Design a protein around this ligand. Structure first.
Ligand SMILES: CCCCCCCCCCCCCCCCCC(=O)OCC(COC(=O)CCCCCCCCCCCCCCCCC)OC(=O)CCCCCCCCCCCCCCCCC
Ligand code: HEA
Ligand code: HEA
Ligand SMILES: CCCCCCCCCCCCCCCCCC(=O)OC[C@H](COP(=O)(O)OCCN)OC(=O)CCCCCCCCCCCCCCCCC
Ligand SMILES: CCCCCCCCCCCCCCCCCC(=O)OC[C@H](COP(=O)(O)OCCN)OC(=O)CCCCCCCCCCCCCCCCC
Ligand SMILES: CCCCCCCCCCCCCCCCCC(=O)OC[C@H](COP(=O)(O)OCCN)OC(=O)CCCCCCCCCCCCCCCCC
Ligand SMILES: CCCCCCCCCCCCCCCCCC(=O)OC[C@H](COP(=O)(O)OCCN)OC(=O)CCCCCCCCCCCCCCCCC
Ligand SMILES: CCCCCCCCCCCCCCCCCC(=O)OC[C@H](COP(=O)(O)OCCN)OC(=O)CCCCCCCCCCCCCCCCC
Ligand code: CUA
Ligand SMILES: [Cu+2]
Ligand SMILES: [Mg+2]
Ligand code: NA
Ligand SMILES: [Zn+2]
Lengths: 47, 79, 76, 53, 48, 514, 44, 227, 260, 57, 94
């Protein structure tokens, strides 16, 4: 309707440039993976 | 009676593995025999058996805390 | 017929019932002048493991100095 | 769904195990004379506590 | 709607159902309670 | 536009996509937490110094996988993506409170991360058992922050459960009966009923010790008449219901994928399906204390609870046997989802039988809070729920995106996942039978062998996660659209095109008059 | 589920770059951290 | 007390542990029975090539499909009911002992007569005398005579624990304000090991348990000679 | 006219997100005050969530009773959802009741083995808790009269029915505050005191929620919002108020008729 | 207290396309801008206190 | 003496149109199951639509657990793929 619909474009992240999209997945899931690393280094500093 | 013994016997009242109620009952009726026989003036040492069984069943920290609470006079039981 | 019946029950049963219960409590509250019980520092009462997040941390939210003693005694 | 259909088949066996149960309570009740009958006076063997149950 | 007239028992009387369930559970709790303090009075009066 | 559509969402498709995003986030947060756990358990001695931070990371592990990962995929994401497109509903009944539950879940994630940030840390495990989490052993804001994170997760889950029950018993076209909906509809219905009648118990328990902590009360302090047994009863009368919430959309998802790719037009014994599902949904409450057998219960109630768990084993066995019967007698397309499903059948079977072995009471006296229980819930979660959601993801991804994965890469992923979880958690069977207790950082020589083997399997699972996100990128980069979809005559979610449009089911479907 | 030819086809090069991309990128966090754990340990 | 490459369980110290592993072997027979059943049926239906995608008839197998689990679950459960009902015979408590779980260690007291209590801790690795066991050795062992039923009164003072002796084959939750009963019997003199089995803080891994089985004669010898 | 189904259409709204963030601010204020004794974030949390819940329901009233998307099937789902929330709160309260029953059926050893624990003087249930039951039951029968007067269509009688039930509910709340000022001990005083104080104050939180719902439904009815049959706001009010009536009855019989 | 519903409804269902969360005009728009300026600024103030509790003194 | 407003002059919009549809007896917004169960060749099952495409779901057996979903277009009457009942489209523009 008034909102554009189709494959890929119904995602919160833009799709058309696949290198930049790969950069988005790497930074997103890498920050997700590196979060508990940052917790454990934070108490190892704090203790 | 004045039977010889070594260990707390199994209570037929409480088959269940919880004996907090068991030693609490032993504590209260130990104080009941002590006040009842100070009232009647009889041989007050006949419940040395109940004194031994509550000492055996519930731990030294708990009996010391309850004894000190009675000695200062603020025991939260019906004694 | 239902609405009339409920109106009649409200006016002739519920309101007189609340009037009688209010009168009962109001008469009792004028005759009863409760002898504040003597303070006994029972170890299972007035437990403070952490201070409250208000005031001095030692008064309850609905504290009443006349009836609610602190862990140490009455305030008076 | 078969336990809904054939639930009536357990009522009569339930009455049988209940009937055997209350008969056992009768033997426990009418036991003023365990090992007191003068015809069956025998001293109890060391591995048993009652003559019959 | 099947019947031409609305039956008086078409919808359950929820006040009656709640009163029935509440009275039954209250009487069960009261009965088991009076059984317990009767047992306790028995033992404390006869020393058992 | 972006803020109005995505940040201010009201449609189940976009809300499900953002569920999938947050679920992937929390999933690899949990993966990293488990890797800290297992790399600490890979070497004899203490890798991370004190084991207080080890208790913190196992607590975070349990919380972010149970409450933050598979409930957001299966219940939230897959439920919101499929259920309207499965019953014919355009939208769901209450989409604003749906979106409020969504937008309130990452605040609970933030509170959990802040509890990790707190100096004290959440050194308590999944359970918040007092007085370990009391005013003497955990005097700090970390455990309180975990309690409010549980509050937020509970509130979001209750309002989501209201959403599912109203969108099932409302949004259906009127002439279809309840007893002919697809199986995932019954799964979400029974799980959401269990949510609705279980999460108040957790909320009551966590409020109970919240008032014990901050309001200076004594509900769990036995010096003032408290009772930790009360907390264990409340928490696990939540727990095993929450277990069955945690597992039954796996039943629904694999049933749909089996009747899809097995060539069937129907599951076998759909009356038997729904009867077994409401049987376990009904008597899932009264089995709550099988996790409880060594706290000092009476013998009679122990016998009652173990008998009730044997009883609840019966219809789940009917479910798995009829799963075998519904995959009977058809051509099997060797999709990766079938590989996930068959692995789920085997590993759910062995995990459930291990659970029965726990459920016998005296063996639970000996084997409580031991890695045999770990092997239970990893054989039924770390590959049960995990393979269920992998099957769901690799099956419905063209509906979710519009493009397909690579079949060879997905089968390789199944192989890596399978080998990693089996030679991880069969040594955990050996560890539990040998008997070291849980929540330990260091272990002796007997346990070193299986600890090393299962740690190497955990790193195999790391490689599996990396391959999974690689093939997600590969699918989104190759962007192969789907020309045709089989079994669309019997699957409602597949006939709106891949992906379905923004406004589906504008006209409600024409149900037969009968 | 049948699909049309890839709209964009990755080259051995592209596939290689990407597979390695995350592999390394996703594990690098672990790298820096796990690598200096003992240093981190130093209260200094 | 475990040996490397252990696949089964600890050998028994208690007779209840003996028939409990007999029952456990029965349950293992059941689990490979069902697992082999499902494996062979899966292999059969993956190795087939015949198609039958009609309307399957249903009301023909549910009676067998519900009575075979009925019988197999109840014949697993009745050994479980028997073993659980014989966990609690009328005890002959020749000896009594209370265990009081403290923050990061244990306390053991013999309180039948001549009141005795002591605290048991974790022997450090650097302080370990050569030949001993890491994570199991305790500077003060707990002694009990063989071939006797001894009563175990378990509780804790600040944090809940679990007194676990898998060699004796039991695990009792130590709860503040609540003590539970465990009856211990042994068949062999010597050392037997266990640990805590509840989370209890920043030294949870470091409260192990050691019970050495001695006769009553050496028991009273130690009791007299420790003064 | 493009929407062919008779279900509900939602224009996307910011208010679920802002309500979620307001709940996050509420809990952050709770931890900030419980640990670092700061009230500013807590007052921010109360202001945020109360305002946000206000315009959320203000939006739903706009889009329902003036725009007219609330199809009979839609309030059928609304009564489903209200019943679901009601039974969730039944099991919430019942968890609290069963916590009390676990505490009271087996009195722990430090309490003297008697219920209540000795040395405390709980208030007699004979007069003012009967007043509480009378005022709440009178309010419930008055709102049943209000529903039947909705059926009949008599506006001034509906007005007096609502005015008397808000008057009764506020009298209930202020008096239970008065014997909170007139009780022998506090919530930090013992297992029994802690459980009934927490349960009764938590019921007090529900009855002030119910009274505020009665305030708002009164101000709708003064603005001629409710009609003869589409009166689901007062249906929800009646269900919630009968709920707090029966929950008050349960906690009454338990706490007061049990062990006093 | 007369009836106000049938006169204000024609100021709601007119299809000018501007969204239903802004029907009232400037006052509800002012309240929207106010609650937007505080639900995000407060969240930044919330996580700042979380950061200060995270990093000790 | 009227008191409460009557919903026939209170309700506006979609409630107003659904109520006037109810009082005239015709339901065009699918609040009710359809009528005219007749799937022969000479008469098919009539289905109303405003578009050119329209979904149908056949419960083509009594108490059938299976539901058969398929699309139709304006033109020739659509059929069921496992039972063969016929469905036809008619446009109604409301
Ligand atoms: C719309 C038009 C473009 C607008 C700008 C896009 C870039 C900034 C942005 O607002 O970006 C949007 C945001 C959206 O993030 C959130 O909303 C946060 C959720 C927590 O993206 C992120 O933050 C990072 C996302 C990285 C890629 C994730 C891939 C997930 C693959 C696996 C799941 C597949 C599910 C298929 C279904
Ligand atoms: C998916 C999650 C999941 C599922 C399905 C289950 C299912 C079951 N669980 Fe468990 N469980 C957990 C998750 C789960 N559990 C977790 C997370 C914990 C511990 C949390 C913590 O410690 O903090 C736990 C803990 C736990 C314990 C506690 C042990 C302890 O810590 O002391 C017990 C013991 O009774 C138990 C039992 C069971 C049983 C009896 C089943 C059954 O429902 C399994 C039934 C499944 C079957 C497949 C039945 C097998 C039947 C057949 C194969 C048919 C043919 C066979 C026959 C006819 C005999 N579970
Ligand atoms: C959902 C629940 C869940 C899952 C998946 C796992 C998965 C794993 N668990 Fe977990 N575990 C628990 C729940 C879970 N665990 C609980 C509840 C405890 C007890 C805590 C306590 O004692 O209180 C526990 C305890 C526990 C311990 C005991 C620590 C201790 O007590 O000393 C160990 C150590 O080996 C362990 C290891 C693992 C490993 C190696 C995995 C691996 O399987 C990890 C690999 C799995 C995945 C990576 C999931 C796949 C998901 C994705 C890849 C992303 C999803 C994204 C999309 C679908 C788009 N677990
Ligand atoms: C010697 C014998 C001693 C006992 C004699 C009395 C036995 C019980 C008699 C009362 C009874 O059964 O009441 C049931 C009735 C249920 O109500 P219901 O079925 O809805 O009927 C009302 C019609 N609208 O209940 C009621 O109507 C009121 C329920 C109790 C309210 C207090
Ligand atoms: C605390 C949070 C309360 C949230 C709440 O009550 O939201 C109101 C919710 C939203 O209205 P809803 O019906 O979803 O709108 C779409 C169709 N009108 O309203 C509803 O969904 C109807 C009532 C739900 C009550 C939920 C209470 C929690
Ligand atoms: C070395 C890593 C890059 C390999 C690139 C390459 O050779 O790609 C070709 C092929 C692409 O996949 P293809 O076989 O075309 O499609 C499978 C259909 N389901 O690649 C593959 O099939 C995967 C090869 C993986 C080798 C490791
Ligand atoms: C998957 C199989 C079903 C689940 C089994 C879980 C329990 C388990 O792994 O038991 C191991 C079992 C018992 O070990 P056992 O052989 O008795 O060791 C003592 C003397 N070797 O040991 C065995 O059964 C043999 C080794 C594993 C075979 C598979
Ligand atoms: C805890 C927070 C949650 C408490 C429970 C909330 C339950 C809300 C149920 C809402 C049900 C609903 O959506 O009803 C539909 C109705 C619109 O339809 P309706 O008005 O009936 O029909 C048009 C009339 N011609 O929509 C409505 O009636 C929406 C408005 C319902 C709620 C009105 C406000 C009640 C506020 C109570 C809490 C007050 C908090 C602040 C004060 C206390 C602070 C501690
Ligand atoms: Cu004590 Cu772990
Ligand atoms: Cu369970
Ligand atoms: Mg435990
Ligand atoms: Na380690
Ligand atoms: Zn058909």
């Amino acid at each position: 309707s008034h909102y554009e619909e189709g494959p890929g474009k119904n995602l919160p992240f833009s799709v058309e440039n696949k290198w930049r999209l790969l950069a988005m997945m790497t930074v997103y899931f890498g920050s997700g993976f590196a979060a508990p690393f940052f917790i454990v280094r934070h108490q190892l500093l704090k203790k | 009676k004045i039977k010889n013994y070594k260990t707390a016997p199994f209570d037929s009242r409480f088959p269940n593995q919880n004996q907090t109620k068991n030693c609490w009952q032993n504590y209260l009726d130990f104080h009941r025999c002590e006040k009842a026989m100070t009232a009647k003036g009889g041989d007050v040492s006949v419940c040395e058996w109940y004194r031994r069984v509550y000492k055996s069943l519930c731990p030294v920290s708990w009996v010391s805390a309850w004894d000190d609470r009675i000695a200062e006079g603020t025991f939260p039981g019906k004694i | 017929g239902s609405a009339r019946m409920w109106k009649a029950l409200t006016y002739f049963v519920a309101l007189p019932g609340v009037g009688v219960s209010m009168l009962n409590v109001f008469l009792k509250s004028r005759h009863e002048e409760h002898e504040r019980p003597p303070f006994v520092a029972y170890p299972h009462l007035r437990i403070r493991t952490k201070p409250f997040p208000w005031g001095d941390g030692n008064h309850t939210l609905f504290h009443n100095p006349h009836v609610n003693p602190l862990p140490t005694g009455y305030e008076d | 769904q078969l336990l809904r259909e054939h639930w009536v088949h357990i009522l009569v066996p339930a009455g049988f195990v209940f009937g055997c149960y209350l008969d056992r309570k009768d033997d426990e009740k009418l036991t003023a004379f365990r090992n007191k009958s003068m015809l069956f006076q025998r001293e109890l063997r060391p591995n048993e506590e009652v003559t019959w149950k | 709607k099947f019947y031409v007239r609305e039956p008086v028992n078409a919808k359950p009387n929820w006040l009656a159902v709640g009163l029935s369930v509440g009275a039954s559970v209250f009487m069960w709790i009261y009965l088991i309670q009076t059984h317990n303090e009767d047992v306790l009075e028995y033992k404390r009066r006869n020393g058992l | 536009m972006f803020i109005n559509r995505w940040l201010f969402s009201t449609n189940h498709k976009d809300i499900g996509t953002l569920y999938l995003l947050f679920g992937a986030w929390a999933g690899m947060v949990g993966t990293a937490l488990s890797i800290l756990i297992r790399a600490e358990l890979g070497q004899p001695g203490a890798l991370l110094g004190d084991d207080q931070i080890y208790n913190v990371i196992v607590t975070a592990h349990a919380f972010v996988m149970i409450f933050f990962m598979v409930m957001p995929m299966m219940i939230g994401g897959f439920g919101n993506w499929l259920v309207p497109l499965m019953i014919g509903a355009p939208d769901m009944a209450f989409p604003r409170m749906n979106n409020m539950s969504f937008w309130l879940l990452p605040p609970s994630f933030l509170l959990l991360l802040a509890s990790s940030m707190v100096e004290a840390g959440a050194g308590t495990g999944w359970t918040v058992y007092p007085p370990l989490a009391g005013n003497l052993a955990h005097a700090g804001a970390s455990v309180d922050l975990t309690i409010f994170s549980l509050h937020l997760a509970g509130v979001s889950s209750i309002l989501g459960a209201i959403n599912f029950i109203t969108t099932i018993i409302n949004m259906k076209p009127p002439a279809m009966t309840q007893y002919q909906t697809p199986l995932f509809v019954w799964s979400v219905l029974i799980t959401a009923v269990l949510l609705l009648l279980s999460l108040p118990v957790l909320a009551a328990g966590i409020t109970m010790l919240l008032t014990d902590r901050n309001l200076n009360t004594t509900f769990f302090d036995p010096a003032g008449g408290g009772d930790p047994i009360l907390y264990q009863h409340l928490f696990w009368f939540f727990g095993h219901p929450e277990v069955y919430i945690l597992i039954l959309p796996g039943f629904g998802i694999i049933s749909h994928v089996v009747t899809y790719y097995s060539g069937k037009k129907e599951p076998f014994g759909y009356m038997g399906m729904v009867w077994a599902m409401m049987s376990i949904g009904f008597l899932g409450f009264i089995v709550w204390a099988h996790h409880m057998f060594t706290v000092g219960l009476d013998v009679d109630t122990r016998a009652y609870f173990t008998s009730a768990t044997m009883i609840i084993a019966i219809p789940t066995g009917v479910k798995v046997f009829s799963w075998l019967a519904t995959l009977h007698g058809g051509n099997i397309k060797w999709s990766p989802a079938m590989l996930w499903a068959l692995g789920f059948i085997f590993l759910f079977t062995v995990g459930g039988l291990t659970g029965i072995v726990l459920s016998n009471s005296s063996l639970d006296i000996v084997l409580h809070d031991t890695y045999y229980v770990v092997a239970h819930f990893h054989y039924v979660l770390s590959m049960g729920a995990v393979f269920a959601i992998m099957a769901g993801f690799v099956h419905w991804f063209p509906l979710f995106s519009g493009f397909t994965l690579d079949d060879t890469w997905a089968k390789a992923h199944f192989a890596i996942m399978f080998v990693g979880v089996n030679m991880t958690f069969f040594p955990q069977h050996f560890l539990g039978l040998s008997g070291m207790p849980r929540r330990y950082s260091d272990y002796p020589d007997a346990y070193t062998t299986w600890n090393t083997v299962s740690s190497m399997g955990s790193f195999i699972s790391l490689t599996a996660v990396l391959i999974m996100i690689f093939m997600i990128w590969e699918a989104f980069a190759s962007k192969r659209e789907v020309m045709s979809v089989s079994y669309a005559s019997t699957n409602l979610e597949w006939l709106h095109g891949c992906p379905p449009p923004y406004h589906t089911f504008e006209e409600p479907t024409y149900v037969k008059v009968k | 589920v049948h699909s049309k030819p890839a709209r964009e086809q990755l080259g051995v090069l592209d596939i290689t770059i990407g597979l390695t991309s995350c592999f390394v990128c996703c594990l690098l966090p672990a790298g820096w951290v796990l690598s200096h754990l003992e240093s981190y340990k130093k209260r200094e | 007390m475990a040996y490397p490459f252990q696949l089964g369980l600890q050998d028994a110290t208690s007779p209840i542990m003996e028939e409990l592993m007999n029952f456990h072997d029965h349950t293992l027979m059941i689990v490979f029975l069902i697992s082999s059943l499902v494996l062979y049926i899966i292999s059969l239906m993956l190795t087939t090539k015949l198609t039958h995608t009609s309307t399957m008839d249903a009301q023909e197998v549910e009676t067998i499909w519900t009575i075979l689990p009925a019988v197999i679950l109840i014949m697993i459960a009745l050994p479980s009911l028997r073993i659980l009902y014989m966990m609690d015979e009328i005890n002959n408590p020749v000896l009594t002992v209370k265990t009081m779980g403290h923050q990061w260690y244990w306390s053991y007291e013999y309180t039948d007569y001549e009141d005795l209590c002591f605290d048991s801790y974790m022997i450090p690795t650097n302080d370990l005398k050569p030949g001993e066991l890491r994570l199991l050795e305790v500077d003060n062992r707990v002694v009990l005579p063989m071939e006797l039923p001894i009563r175990m009164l378990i509780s804790s003072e600040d944090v809940l624990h679990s007194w676990a002796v898998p060699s004796l084959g039991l695990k009792t939750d130590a709860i503040p304000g609540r003590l539970n009963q465990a009856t211990v019997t042994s068949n062999r003199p010597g050392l037997f090991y266990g640990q805590c089995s509840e989370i209890c803080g920043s030294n949870h891994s470091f409260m192990p348990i050691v019970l050495e089985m001695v006769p009553l004669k050496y028991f009273e010898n130690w009791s007299a000679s420790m003064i | 006219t493009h929407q062919t189904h008779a279900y509900h259409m939602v224009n996307p709204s910011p208010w679920p997100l802002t309500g979620a963030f307001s709940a996050l601010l509420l809990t952050s204020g709770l931890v900030m005050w419980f640990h670092y004794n700061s009230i500013t974030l807590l007052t921010l949390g109360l202001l945020t969530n109360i305002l946000t819940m206000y315009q959320w329901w203000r939006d739903v009233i706009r889009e329902g009773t003036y725009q007219g998307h609330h199809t009979p099937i839609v309030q059928k789902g609304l009564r489903y959802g209200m019943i679901l929330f009601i039974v969730s709160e039944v099991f919430f309260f019942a968890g609290f009741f069963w916590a009390f029953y676990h505490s009271s059926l087996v009195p722990t050893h430090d309490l003297g083995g008697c219920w209540p624990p000795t040395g405390i003087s709980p208030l007699n249930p004979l007069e003012v808790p009967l007043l509480n039951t009378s005022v709440l039951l009178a309010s419930g029968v008055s709102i049943t009269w209000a529903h039947h007067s909705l059926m009949e269509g008599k506006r001034n009688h509906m007005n007096q029915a609502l005015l008397i039930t808000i008057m009764l509910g506020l009298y209930f709340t202020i008096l239970q505050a008065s014997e909170y000022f007139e009780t022998s001990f506090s919530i930090s005083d013992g297992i029994y005191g802690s459980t009934f104080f927490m349960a009764t104050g938590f019921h007090g939180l529900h009855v002030i929620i119910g009274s505020t719902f009665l305030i708002v439904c009164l101000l709708r009815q003064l603005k001629f919002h409710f009609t003869s049959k589409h009166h689901f706001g007062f249906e929800a009010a009646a269900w919630y108020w009968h709920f707090v009536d029966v929950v008050w009855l349960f906690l009454y019989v338990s706490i007061y008729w049990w062990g006093s | 207290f007369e009836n106000k519903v049938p006169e204000k409804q024609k100021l709601f269902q007119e299809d000018n396309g501007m969204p239903v969360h802004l029907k009232g005009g400037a006052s509800d728009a002012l309240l929207y801008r106010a609650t937007m300026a505080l639900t995000l600024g407060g969240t930044a103030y919330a996580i700042y206190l979380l950061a200060m509790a995270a990093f000790p003194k | 003496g009227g008191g409460v407003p009557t919903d026939e002059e209170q309700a506006t919009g979609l409630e107003r149109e659904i109520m006037i549809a109810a009082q005239k007896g015709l339901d065009p917004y699918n609040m009710l199951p359809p009528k005219a169960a007749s799937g022969t060749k000479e008469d098919p099952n009539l289905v109303p639509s405003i578009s050119n495409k329209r979904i149908v779901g056949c419960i083509c057996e009594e108490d059938n657990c299976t539901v058969i979903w398929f699309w139709l277009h304006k033109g020739e009457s659509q059929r069921c793929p496992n039972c063969g009942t016929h469905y036809k489209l008619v446009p109604h523009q409301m």
